[PDB]
Amino acid sequence: DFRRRFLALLSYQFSTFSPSLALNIIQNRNMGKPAQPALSREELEALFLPYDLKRLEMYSRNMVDYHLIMDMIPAISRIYFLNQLGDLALSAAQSALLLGIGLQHKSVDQLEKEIELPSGQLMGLFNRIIRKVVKLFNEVQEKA
């Protein structure tokens, strides 16, 4: 119960926290959490309409604008940290950016100071993140 409260509240007054601290609270080795169920067809259709899913798929090839898909990222970020969406094999650095964009609603430039990694790599890191994300939707759709 406390965790899912914290996920919503990073928007309010917990955005000032550094991304590393938020990662430490949400994941605790002491109390392991079993993986939540993989994304279902009715749940995925409710969250993402086909046009929204189409936008993620075609942008994955492009890697051009980064302004078309900013809306979907907070929706995507919640699923990953809710133990849903299976396993994305996100790295520690990659998980930090997803939390920063999705939940703290920080721009990429601000996280660059925070993460202290160069933006070009951070952009390329986020490019890898959504790539793992977009095919996993396709795996869900193909299973139907």
């Binding site: 590393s20 601290l21 990662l23 430490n24 994941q27 520690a92 930090a96």
Partner: peptide
């Protein structure tokens, strides 16, 4: 990982 980043 995350603990190393905190350090």
């Amino acid at each position: 990982s995350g603990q190393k980043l905190g350090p």
